[PDB]
Amino acid sequence: RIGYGEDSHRLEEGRPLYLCGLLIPSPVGALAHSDGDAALHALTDALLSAYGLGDIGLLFPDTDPRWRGERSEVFLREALRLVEARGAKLLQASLVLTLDRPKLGPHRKALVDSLSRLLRLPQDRIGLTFKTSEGLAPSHVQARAVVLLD
Amino acid sequence: RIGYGEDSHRLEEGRPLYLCGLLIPSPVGALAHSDGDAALHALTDALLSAYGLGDIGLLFPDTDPRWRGERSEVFLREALRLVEARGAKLLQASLVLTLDRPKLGPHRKALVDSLSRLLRLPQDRIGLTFKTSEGLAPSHVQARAVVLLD
Amino acid sequence: RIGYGEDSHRLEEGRPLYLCGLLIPSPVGALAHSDGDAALHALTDALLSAYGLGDIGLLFPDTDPRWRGERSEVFLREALRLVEARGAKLLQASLVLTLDRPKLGPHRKALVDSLSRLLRLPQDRIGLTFKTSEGLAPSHVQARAVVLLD
């Protein structure tokens, strides 16, 4: 099985930045009524998509008291739970984060370790890369993710 | 075998929106020489790409007189015709549709069914997720797709 | 094993365009401290991602005398070395190139031949499709790639 997910969030100055379940020091952060964790959102969508379960707007809306205000990791674990109940075993996750600031390189180890712990995958099965948009999207964080299961 | 494809079109008011082979209610439809069915196009390119066959610009360049107008379903099924002729069996398709308006929630089941129909795949092997552009691309519809075969 | 990678570079008028390791006659070329080869960069990242080796910003920075000034194909070959020393066997690459000008169609055979040579894959396992941004990104070249190994 395969899944593909994408997520993007406007960035505003002085908001906290969350990626891969972590708080990342940054002059900018997700402007939205989520934590705007683009990384986990794309990953979550990718998991749901692999089983035709819908997407995070459908399963985790802020109109539901279960899900409103929850950390994005909560959604991810939920999606993990759902596809495992259908037989899924997650084997690999590869994703790309695009944002003109801040620099994520110094946070590489922590981000990869977090995804490893939240996805329960070995580090060599976590494919994380960092890019800038070269000014094509200087006010947004974008994530695109592919997952492979059994 | 895997394939990856993308498509986008400018959106315009008073225009007809086709998505996944359906006519959808919106202020805007695609500004294209075709029906601008970004979902079907991305999927066609992903299929062609999985066998190195080219892309829709190549195989469907309108100048031929049996492409003018034609529905994008024609393109999709020809691509299906070609990979199966090369021994392929399509197993799964996972795509993301990006568009600020209109909202695709109310058309989700119909959209899946159609892809189920056209791709001759089971519901749980059609991974369709919907996203907004967050102001990055307010005037376009975007689709990106991955396919898995054999 | 699967890997997903992206790259995008600003296009400037008057600068040389390099795609898939080839010089492409064009009014625009990447404005980069590299050769701005979006195609090879996204492929390189996808390969590294498949083994969690990091990304080209990490492995091939211009801070490092061996990599500074080098053609992008040099990085791609090193990434192929790295994953093959981890036992990988590249099976397939599928990428999409997006740019508003120039037209890549007349160059398709050469670009595909370049990638089959560089990746050591037969042409039917090189999936290359060409798109414009429909005016969404008219000053950039964008590349997104999926790789499959073993």
GROMACS .gro file of C-alpha atoms in nm:
model
  450
    1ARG     CA    1   0.000   0.000   0.000
    2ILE     CA    2   0.100   0.359  -0.066
    3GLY     CA    3  -0.029   0.698   0.046
    4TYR     CA    4   0.040   1.058  -0.050
    5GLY     CA    5  -0.038   1.364   0.162
    6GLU     CA    6   0.022   1.735   0.144
    7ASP     CA    7  -0.028   2.028   0.374
    8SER     CA    8   0.056   2.393   0.378
    9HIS     CA    9   0.016   2.670   0.632
   10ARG     CA   10   0.053   3.045   0.619
   11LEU     CA   11   0.330   3.168   0.852
   12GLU     CA   12   0.313   3.473   1.076
   13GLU     CA   13   0.593   3.643   1.272
   14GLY     CA   14   0.594   3.581   1.647
   15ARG     CA   15   0.384   3.262   1.630
   16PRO     CA   16   0.541   2.940   1.758
   17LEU     CA   17   0.655   2.691   1.494
   18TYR     CA   18   0.564   2.325   1.522
   19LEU     CA   19   0.712   2.060   1.293
   20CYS     CA   20   0.730   1.681   1.336
   21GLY     CA   21   0.569   1.723   1.676
   22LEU     CA   22   0.836   1.965   1.797
   23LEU     CA   23   0.847   2.333   1.896
   24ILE     CA   24   1.118   2.483   1.674
   25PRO     CA   25   1.271   2.821   1.761
   26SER     CA   26   1.174   3.048   1.477
   27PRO     CA   27   1.088   3.410   1.391
   28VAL     CA   28   0.770   3.271   1.232
   29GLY     CA   29   0.498   3.013   1.297
   30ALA     CA   30   0.175   2.871   1.164
   31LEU     CA   31  -0.111   3.119   1.130
   32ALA     CA   32  -0.419   2.900   1.176
   33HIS     CA   33  -0.653   2.742   1.431
   34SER     CA   34  -0.435   2.426   1.446
   35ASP     CA   35  -0.072   2.404   1.553
   36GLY     CA   36  -0.012   2.422   1.178
   37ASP     CA   37   0.228   2.126   1.194
   38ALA     CA   38   0.255   2.076   0.820
   39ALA     CA   39   0.481   1.777   0.857
   40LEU     CA   40   0.244   1.572   1.072
   41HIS     CA   41  -0.059   1.687   0.880
   42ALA     CA   42   0.079   1.564   0.544
   43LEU     CA   43   0.189   1.239   0.715
   44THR     CA   44  -0.159   1.189   0.867
   45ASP     CA   45  -0.328   1.253   0.533
   46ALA     CA   46  -0.084   1.015   0.366
   47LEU     CA   47  -0.178   0.739   0.613
   48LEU     CA   48  -0.556   0.792   0.572
   49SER     CA   49  -0.524   0.812   0.195
   50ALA     CA   50  -0.348   0.472   0.192
   51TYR     CA   51  -0.679   0.319   0.307
   52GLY     CA   52  -0.925   0.557   0.144
   53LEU     CA   53  -1.032   0.679   0.491
   54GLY     CA   54  -1.076   1.043   0.392
   55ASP     CA   55  -0.844   1.316   0.523
   56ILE     CA   56  -0.773   1.526   0.832
   57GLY     CA   57  -1.035   1.792   0.749
   58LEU     CA   58  -1.294   1.519   0.744
   59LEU     CA   59  -1.186   1.309   1.048
   60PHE     CA   60  -1.037   1.576   1.277
   61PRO     CA   61  -1.237   1.902   1.243
   62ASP     CA   62  -1.245   2.165   1.515
   63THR     CA   63  -1.623   2.125   1.529
   64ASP     CA   64  -1.557   1.798   1.715
   65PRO     CA   65  -1.466   1.841   2.083
   66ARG     CA   66  -1.255   1.527   2.071
   67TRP     CA   67  -1.019   1.680   1.821
   68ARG     CA   68  -1.038   2.058   1.870
   69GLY     CA   69  -0.722   2.205   2.019
   70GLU     CA   70  -0.542   1.872   2.021
   71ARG     CA   71  -0.171   1.853   1.927
   72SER     CA   72  -0.125   1.730   1.567
   73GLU     CA   73   0.050   1.416   1.696
   74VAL     CA   74  -0.290   1.316   1.837
   75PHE     CA   75  -0.431   1.302   1.486
   76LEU     CA   76  -0.134   1.108   1.358
   77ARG     CA   77  -0.162   0.843   1.628
   78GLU     CA   78  -0.532   0.817   1.549
   79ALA     CA   79  -0.464   0.763   1.182
   80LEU     CA   80  -0.200   0.507   1.274
   81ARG     CA   81  -0.453   0.327   1.488
   82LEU     CA   82  -0.711   0.325   1.211
   83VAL     CA   83  -0.494   0.169   0.941
   84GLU     CA   84  -0.348  -0.078   1.182
   85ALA     CA   85  -0.703  -0.197   1.259
   86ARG     CA   86  -0.741  -0.269   0.886
   87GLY     CA   87  -0.420  -0.473   0.876
   88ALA     CA   88  -0.160  -0.203   0.807
   89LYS     CA   89   0.201  -0.211   0.909
   90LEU     CA   90   0.386   0.112   0.834
   91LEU     CA   91   0.720   0.051   0.669
   92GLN     CA   92   0.851   0.387   0.549
   93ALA     CA   93   0.778   0.757   0.541
   94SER     CA   94   0.947   1.004   0.308
   95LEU     CA   95   0.866   1.376   0.322
   96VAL     CA   96   0.986   1.718   0.218
   97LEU     CA   97   0.952   2.041   0.414
   98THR     CA   98   0.967   2.367   0.223
   99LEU     CA   99   1.000   2.696   0.409
  100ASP     CA  100   1.222   2.997   0.350
  101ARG     CA  101   1.284   3.037   0.725
  102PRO     CA  102   1.395   2.935   0.966
  103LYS     CA  103   1.694   2.710   0.900
  104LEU     CA  104   1.595   2.354   0.997
  105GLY     CA  105   1.933   2.183   0.945
  106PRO     CA  106   2.044   2.231   1.307
  107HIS     CA  107   1.719   2.062   1.409
  108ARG     CA  108   1.757   1.764   1.179
  109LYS     CA  109   1.847   1.506   1.441
  110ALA     CA  110   1.561   1.608   1.672
  111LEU     CA  111   1.303   1.618   1.397
  112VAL     CA  112   1.404   1.282   1.259
  113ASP     CA  113   1.412   1.131   1.612
  114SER     CA  114   1.064   1.261   1.679
  115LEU     CA  115   0.922   1.116   1.358
  116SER     CA  116   1.098   0.789   1.439
  117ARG     CA  117   0.934   0.776   1.781
  118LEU     CA  118   0.590   0.892   1.665
  119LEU     CA  119   0.582   0.664   1.358
  120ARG     CA  120   0.761   0.371   1.529
  121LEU     CA  121   1.008   0.339   1.244
  122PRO     CA  122   1.387   0.297   1.246
  123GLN     CA  123   1.580   0.611   1.142
  124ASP     CA  124   1.678   0.477   0.801
  125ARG     CA  125   1.308   0.443   0.722
  126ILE     CA  126   1.247   0.810   0.799
  127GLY     CA  127   1.319   1.015   0.486
  128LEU     CA  128   1.320   1.380   0.584
  129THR     CA  129   1.457   1.659   0.361
  130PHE     CA  130   1.454   2.041   0.398
  131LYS     CA  131   1.420   2.296   0.118
  132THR     CA  132   1.363   2.666   0.067
  133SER     CA  133   1.109   2.796  -0.186
  134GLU     CA  134   1.363   3.045  -0.332
  135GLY     CA  135   1.097   3.306  -0.274
  136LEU     CA  136   0.818   3.118  -0.451
  137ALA     CA  137   0.630   3.086  -0.117
  138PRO     CA  138   0.816   3.298   0.138
  139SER     CA  139   0.522   3.318   0.380
  140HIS     CA  140   0.423   2.951   0.397
  141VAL     CA  141   0.541   2.620   0.530
  142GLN     CA  142   0.469   2.334   0.286
  143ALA     CA  143   0.495   1.956   0.339
  144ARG     CA  144   0.453   1.666   0.096
  145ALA     CA  145   0.471   1.309   0.218
  146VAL     CA  146   0.475   0.957   0.081
  147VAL     CA  147   0.417   0.650   0.302
  148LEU     CA  148   0.468   0.284   0.224
  149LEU     CA  149   0.289   0.010   0.419
  150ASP     CA  150   0.369  -0.363   0.421
  151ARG     CA  151   0.589  -0.003  -1.042
  152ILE     CA  152   0.515   0.353  -0.930
  153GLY     CA  153   0.408   0.668  -1.113
  154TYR     CA  154   0.392   1.033  -1.006
  155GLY     CA  155   0.204   1.311  -1.186
  156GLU     CA  156   0.073   1.664  -1.145
  157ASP     CA  157  -0.162   1.908  -1.309
  158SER     CA  158  -0.294   2.258  -1.241
  159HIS     CA  159  -0.518   2.508  -1.423
  160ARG     CA  160  -0.616   2.870  -1.370
  161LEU     CA  161  -0.966   2.903  -1.222
  162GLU     CA  162  -1.218   3.156  -1.353
  163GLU     CA  163  -1.566   3.263  -1.251
  164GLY     CA  164  -1.854   3.159  -1.478
  165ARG     CA  165  -1.650   2.854  -1.568
  166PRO     CA  166  -1.719   2.479  -1.557
  167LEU     CA  167  -1.519   2.286  -1.299
  168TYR     CA  168  -1.456   1.920  -1.379
  169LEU     CA  169  -1.295   1.708  -1.103
  170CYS     CA  170  -1.226   1.335  -1.116
  171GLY     CA  171  -1.455   1.320  -1.417
  172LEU     CA  172  -1.748   1.506  -1.256
  173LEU     CA  173  -1.905   1.848  -1.310
  174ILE     CA  174  -1.890   2.032  -0.977
  175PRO     CA  175  -2.085   2.336  -0.850
  176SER     CA  176  -1.858   2.641  -0.806
  177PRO     CA  177  -1.815   3.010  -0.886
  178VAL     CA  178  -1.522   2.904  -1.101
  179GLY     CA  179  -1.419   2.635  -1.348
  180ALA     CA  180  -1.094   2.566  -1.532
  181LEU     CA  181  -0.948   2.802  -1.789
  182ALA     CA  182  -0.821   2.537  -2.029
  183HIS     CA  183  -0.835   2.400  -2.378
  184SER     CA  184  -0.971   2.084  -2.208
  185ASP     CA  185  -1.218   2.035  -1.922
  186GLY     CA  186  -0.916   2.114  -1.710
  187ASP     CA  187  -0.976   1.802  -1.497
  188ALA     CA  188  -0.662   1.836  -1.289
  189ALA     CA  189  -0.741   1.517  -1.095
  190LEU     CA  190  -0.774   1.304  -1.411
  191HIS     CA  191  -0.477   1.469  -1.578
  192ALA     CA  192  -0.238   1.414  -1.287
  193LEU     CA  193  -0.358   1.057  -1.274
  194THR     CA  194  -0.306   1.007  -1.648
  195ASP     CA  195   0.051   1.141  -1.625
  196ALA     CA  196   0.123   0.927  -1.319
  197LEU     CA  197   0.010   0.616  -1.516
  198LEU     CA  198   0.212   0.705  -1.828
  199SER     CA  199   0.514   0.789  -1.613
  200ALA     CA  200   0.500   0.446  -1.448
  201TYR     CA  201   0.595   0.292  -1.785
  202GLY     CA  202   0.800   0.577  -1.929
  203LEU     CA  203   0.540   0.636  -2.199
  204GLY     CA  204   0.555   1.016  -2.190
  205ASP     CA  205   0.287   1.254  -2.066
  206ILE     CA  206  -0.048   1.401  -2.173
  207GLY     CA  207   0.115   1.698  -2.348
  208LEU     CA  208   0.278   1.440  -2.572
  209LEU     CA  209   0.008   1.183  -2.622
  210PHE     CA  210  -0.282   1.432  -2.613
  211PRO     CA  211  -0.172   1.754  -2.789
  212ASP     CA  212  -0.504   1.911  -2.905
  213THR     CA  213  -0.389   1.974  -3.265
  214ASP     CA  214  -0.501   1.623  -3.351
  215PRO     CA  215  -0.870   1.638  -3.448
  216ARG     CA  216  -0.989   1.377  -3.201
  217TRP     CA  217  -0.866   1.565  -2.895
  218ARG     CA  218  -1.047   1.897  -2.949
  219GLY     CA  219  -1.298   1.913  -2.666
  220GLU     CA  220  -1.257   1.551  -2.567
  221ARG     CA  221  -1.338   1.448  -2.207
  222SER     CA  222  -1.033   1.383  -1.984
  223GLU     CA  223  -1.183   1.038  -1.917
  224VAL     CA  224  -1.076   0.955  -2.269
  225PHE     CA  225  -0.715   1.038  -2.182
  226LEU     CA  226  -0.726   0.843  -1.856
  227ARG     CA  227  -0.863   0.527  -2.014
  228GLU     CA  228  -0.611   0.542  -2.298
  229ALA     CA  229  -0.333   0.553  -2.041
  230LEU     CA  230  -0.491   0.260  -1.866
  231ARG     CA  231  -0.514   0.083  -2.201
  232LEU     CA  232  -0.142   0.139  -2.259
  233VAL     CA  233   0.000   0.025  -1.921
  234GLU     CA  234  -0.223  -0.283  -1.913
  235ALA     CA  235  -0.097  -0.360  -2.260
  236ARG     CA  236   0.246  -0.347  -2.103
  237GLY     CA  237   0.136  -0.600  -1.842
  238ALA     CA  238   0.039  -0.362  -1.565
  239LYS     CA  239  -0.229  -0.405  -1.309
  240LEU     CA  240  -0.315  -0.081  -1.130
  241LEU     CA  241  -0.334  -0.147  -0.757
  242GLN     CA  242  -0.384   0.187  -0.597
  243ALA     CA  243  -0.403   0.560  -0.656
  244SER     CA  244  -0.349   0.833  -0.398
  245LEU     CA  245  -0.396   1.198  -0.486
  246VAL     CA  246  -0.430   1.541  -0.327
  247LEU     CA  247  -0.656   1.814  -0.468
  248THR     CA  248  -0.568   2.173  -0.367
  249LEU     CA  249  -0.823   2.453  -0.414
  250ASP     CA  250  -0.955   2.736  -0.196
  251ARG     CA  251  -1.300   2.714  -0.356
  252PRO     CA  252  -1.529   2.557  -0.379
  253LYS     CA  253  -1.525   2.313  -0.088
  254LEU     CA  254  -1.507   1.951  -0.203
  255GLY     CA  255  -1.640   1.794   0.118
  256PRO     CA  256  -1.998   1.763  -0.014
  257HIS     CA  257  -1.874   1.581  -0.325
  258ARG     CA  258  -1.633   1.341  -0.162
  259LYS     CA  259  -1.824   1.016  -0.201
  260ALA     CA  260  -1.923   1.097  -0.559
  261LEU     CA  261  -1.565   1.190  -0.638
  262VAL     CA  262  -1.434   0.862  -0.499
  263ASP     CA  263  -1.698   0.653  -0.677
  264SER     CA  264  -1.608   0.811  -1.005
  265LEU     CA  265  -1.239   0.738  -0.962
  266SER     CA  266  -1.339   0.391  -0.846
  267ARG     CA  267  -1.532   0.354  -1.170
  268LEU     CA  268  -1.271   0.503  -1.403
  269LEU     CA  269  -0.970   0.337  -1.237
  270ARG     CA  270  -1.163   0.016  -1.176
  271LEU     CA  271  -1.030   0.011  -0.820
  272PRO     CA  272  -1.193  -0.064  -0.486
  273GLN     CA  273  -1.297   0.223  -0.268
  274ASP     CA  274  -1.021   0.160  -0.014
  275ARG     CA  275  -0.757   0.174  -0.292
  276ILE     CA  276  -0.864   0.525  -0.394
  277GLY     CA  277  -0.686   0.776  -0.169
  278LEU     CA  278  -0.837   1.123  -0.227
  279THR     CA  279  -0.765   1.410   0.010
  280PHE     CA  280  -0.875   1.774  -0.019
  281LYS     CA  281  -0.674   2.082   0.077
  282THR     CA  282  -0.698   2.462   0.048
  283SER     CA  283  -0.400   2.669  -0.072
  284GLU     CA  284  -0.395   2.900   0.229
  285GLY     CA  285  -0.379   3.201  -0.002
  286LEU     CA  286  -0.080   3.063  -0.185
  287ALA     CA  287  -0.282   2.976  -0.496
  288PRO     CA  288  -0.629   3.127  -0.468
  289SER     CA  289  -0.695   3.118  -0.842
  290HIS     CA  290  -0.586   2.770  -0.934
  291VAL     CA  291  -0.683   2.414  -0.885
  292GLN     CA  292  -0.391   2.177  -0.829
  293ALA     CA  293  -0.364   1.799  -0.829
  294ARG     CA  294  -0.073   1.573  -0.751
  295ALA     CA  295  -0.100   1.194  -0.777
  296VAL     CA  296   0.089   0.874  -0.708
  297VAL     CA  297  -0.004   0.538  -0.856
  298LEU     CA  298   0.101   0.187  -0.758
  299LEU     CA  299   0.090  -0.108  -1.000
  300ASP     CA  300   0.143  -0.487  -0.990
  301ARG     CA  301   1.212   0.127  -0.043
  302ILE     CA  302   1.055   0.452  -0.157
  303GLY     CA  303   1.187   0.808  -0.152
  304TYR     CA  304   1.033   1.142  -0.236
  305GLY     CA  305   1.226   1.462  -0.315
  306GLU     CA  306   1.159   1.816  -0.439
  307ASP     CA  307   1.358   2.111  -0.559
  308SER     CA  308   1.269   2.452  -0.705
  309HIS     CA  309   1.495   2.730  -0.826
  310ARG     CA  310   1.428   3.085  -0.936
  311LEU     CA  311   1.470   3.132  -1.311
  312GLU     CA  312   1.658   3.434  -1.436
  313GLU     CA  313   1.669   3.565  -1.794
  314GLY     CA  314   2.000   3.521  -1.970
  315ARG     CA  315   2.132   3.241  -1.746
  316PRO     CA  316   2.193   2.886  -1.873
  317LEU     CA  317   1.923   2.624  -1.807
  318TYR     CA  318   2.041   2.283  -1.687
  319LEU     CA  319   1.791   1.997  -1.656
  320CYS     CA  320   1.858   1.627  -1.609
  321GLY     CA  321   2.227   1.705  -1.656
  322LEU     CA  322   2.172   1.871  -1.994
  323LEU     CA  323   2.214   2.232  -2.115
  324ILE     CA  324   1.872   2.338  -2.254
  325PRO     CA  325   1.858   2.640  -2.487
  326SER     CA  326   1.631   2.885  -2.315
  327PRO     CA  327   1.577   3.257  -2.243
  328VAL     CA  328   1.587   3.175  -1.872
  329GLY     CA  329   1.814   2.979  -1.642
  330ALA     CA  330   1.847   2.910  -1.276
  331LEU     CA  331   1.984   3.185  -1.063
  332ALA     CA  332   2.184   2.957  -0.837
  333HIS     CA  333   2.514   2.905  -0.659
  334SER     CA  334   2.479   2.558  -0.817
  335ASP     CA  335   2.375   2.478  -1.179
  336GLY     CA  336   2.016   2.499  -1.060
  337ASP     CA  337   1.930   2.156  -1.198
  338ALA     CA  338   1.591   2.105  -1.028
  339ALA     CA  339   1.551   1.761  -1.186
  340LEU     CA  340   1.880   1.613  -1.063
  341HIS     CA  341   1.843   1.785  -0.724
  342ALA     CA  342   1.499   1.633  -0.659
  343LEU     CA  343   1.618   1.291  -0.771
  344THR     CA  344   1.925   1.315  -0.551
  345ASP     CA  345   1.715   1.408  -0.247
  346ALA     CA  346   1.468   1.124  -0.317
  347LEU     CA  347   1.750   0.868  -0.325
  348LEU     CA  348   1.903   1.003   0.000
  349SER     CA  349   1.555   1.018   0.158
  350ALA     CA  350   1.501   0.652   0.081
  351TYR     CA  351   1.777   0.569   0.332
  352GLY     CA  352   1.733   0.864   0.563
  353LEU     CA  353   2.080   0.992   0.468
  354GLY     CA  354   1.961   1.353   0.488
  355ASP     CA  355   1.949   1.588   0.188
  356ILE     CA  356   2.173   1.778  -0.055
  357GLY     CA  357   2.186   2.088   0.165
  358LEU     CA  358   2.338   1.860   0.427
  359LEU     CA  359   2.560   1.639   0.216
  360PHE     CA  360   2.676   1.873  -0.062
  361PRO     CA  361   2.699   2.226   0.081
  362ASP     CA  362   2.902   2.493  -0.096
  363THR     CA  363   3.091   2.525   0.236
  364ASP     CA  364   3.267   2.201   0.142
  365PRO     CA  365   3.549   2.229  -0.115
  366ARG     CA  366   3.477   1.891  -0.275
  367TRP     CA  367   3.121   1.987  -0.367
  368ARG     CA  368   3.145   2.363  -0.440
  369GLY     CA  369   3.120   2.448  -0.809
  370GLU     CA  370   3.042   2.087  -0.909
  371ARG     CA  371   2.780   1.987  -1.165
  372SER     CA  372   2.466   1.848  -1.005
  373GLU     CA  373   2.526   1.507  -1.168
  374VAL     CA  374   2.827   1.477  -0.935
  375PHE     CA  375   2.596   1.489  -0.634
  376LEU     CA  376   2.351   1.247  -0.792
  377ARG     CA  377   2.627   0.993  -0.855
  378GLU     CA  378   2.752   1.027  -0.498
  379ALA     CA  379   2.402   0.974  -0.362
  380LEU     CA  380   2.374   0.665  -0.584
  381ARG     CA  381   2.705   0.542  -0.443
  382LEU     CA  382   2.587   0.601  -0.087
  383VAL     CA  383   2.258   0.412  -0.115
  384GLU     CA  384   2.412   0.128  -0.315
  385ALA     CA  385   2.677   0.082  -0.041
  386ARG     CA  386   2.374   0.033   0.183
  387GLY     CA  387   2.267  -0.242  -0.057
  388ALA     CA  388   2.008  -0.052  -0.254
  389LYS     CA  389   1.919  -0.133  -0.613
  390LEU     CA  390   1.746   0.148  -0.793
  391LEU     CA  391   1.442   0.018  -0.977
  392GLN     CA  392   1.252   0.322  -1.091
  393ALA     CA  393   1.236   0.700  -1.092
  394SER     CA  394   0.928   0.909  -1.175
  395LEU     CA  395   0.958   1.286  -1.176
  396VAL     CA  396   0.764   1.591  -1.287
  397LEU     CA  397   0.927   1.910  -1.414
  398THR     CA  398   0.725   2.230  -1.402
  399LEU     CA  399   0.819   2.556  -1.571
  400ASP     CA  400   0.638   2.807  -1.785
  401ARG     CA  401   0.919   2.841  -2.045
  402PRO     CA  402   1.095   2.710  -2.235
  403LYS     CA  403   0.922   2.409  -2.391
  404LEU     CA  404   1.083   2.077  -2.288
  405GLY     CA  405   0.897   1.854  -2.536
  406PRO     CA  406   1.148   1.891  -2.819
  407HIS     CA  407   1.411   1.775  -2.568
  408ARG     CA  408   1.230   1.475  -2.424
  409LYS     CA  409   1.441   1.201  -2.590
  410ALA     CA  410   1.768   1.364  -2.482
  411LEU     CA  411   1.645   1.429  -2.126
  412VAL     CA  412   1.517   1.076  -2.086
  413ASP     CA  413   1.838   0.938  -2.236
  414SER     CA  414   2.039   1.151  -1.990
  415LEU     CA  415   1.847   1.017  -1.690
  416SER     CA  416   1.867   0.656  -1.809
  417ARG     CA  417   2.243   0.697  -1.842
  418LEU     CA  418   2.292   0.868  -1.506
  419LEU     CA  419   2.056   0.640  -1.311
  420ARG     CA  420   2.151   0.322  -1.495
  421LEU     CA  421   1.783   0.240  -1.558
  422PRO     CA  422   1.617   0.127  -1.883
  423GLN     CA  423   1.396   0.391  -2.045
  424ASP     CA  424   1.074   0.223  -1.937
  425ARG     CA  425   1.176   0.275  -1.573
  426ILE     CA  426   1.240   0.646  -1.625
  427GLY     CA  427   0.915   0.838  -1.582
  428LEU     CA  428   0.951   1.199  -1.689
  429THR     CA  429   0.656   1.432  -1.746
  430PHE     CA  430   0.656   1.803  -1.838
  431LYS     CA  431   0.411   2.068  -1.718
  432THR     CA  432   0.376   2.446  -1.708
  433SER     CA  433   0.262   2.625  -1.391
  434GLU     CA  434  -0.028   2.785  -1.575
  435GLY     CA  435   0.107   3.119  -1.452
  436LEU     CA  436   0.111   3.010  -1.089
  437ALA     CA  437   0.497   3.003  -1.077
  438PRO     CA  438   0.628   3.170  -1.392
  439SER     CA  439   0.971   3.260  -1.249
  440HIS     CA  440   1.069   2.919  -1.115
  441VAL     CA  441   1.156   2.571  -1.228
  442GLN     CA  442   1.005   2.307  -0.996
  443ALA     CA  443   1.093   1.937  -0.972
  444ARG     CA  444   0.928   1.660  -0.769
  445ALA     CA  445   1.041   1.299  -0.782
  446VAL     CA  446   0.957   0.954  -0.645
  447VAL     CA  447   1.215   0.674  -0.649
  448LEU     CA  448   1.155   0.301  -0.588
  449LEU     CA  449   1.441   0.066  -0.487
  450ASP     CA  450   1.488  -0.308  -0.447
   0.00000   0.00000   0.00000
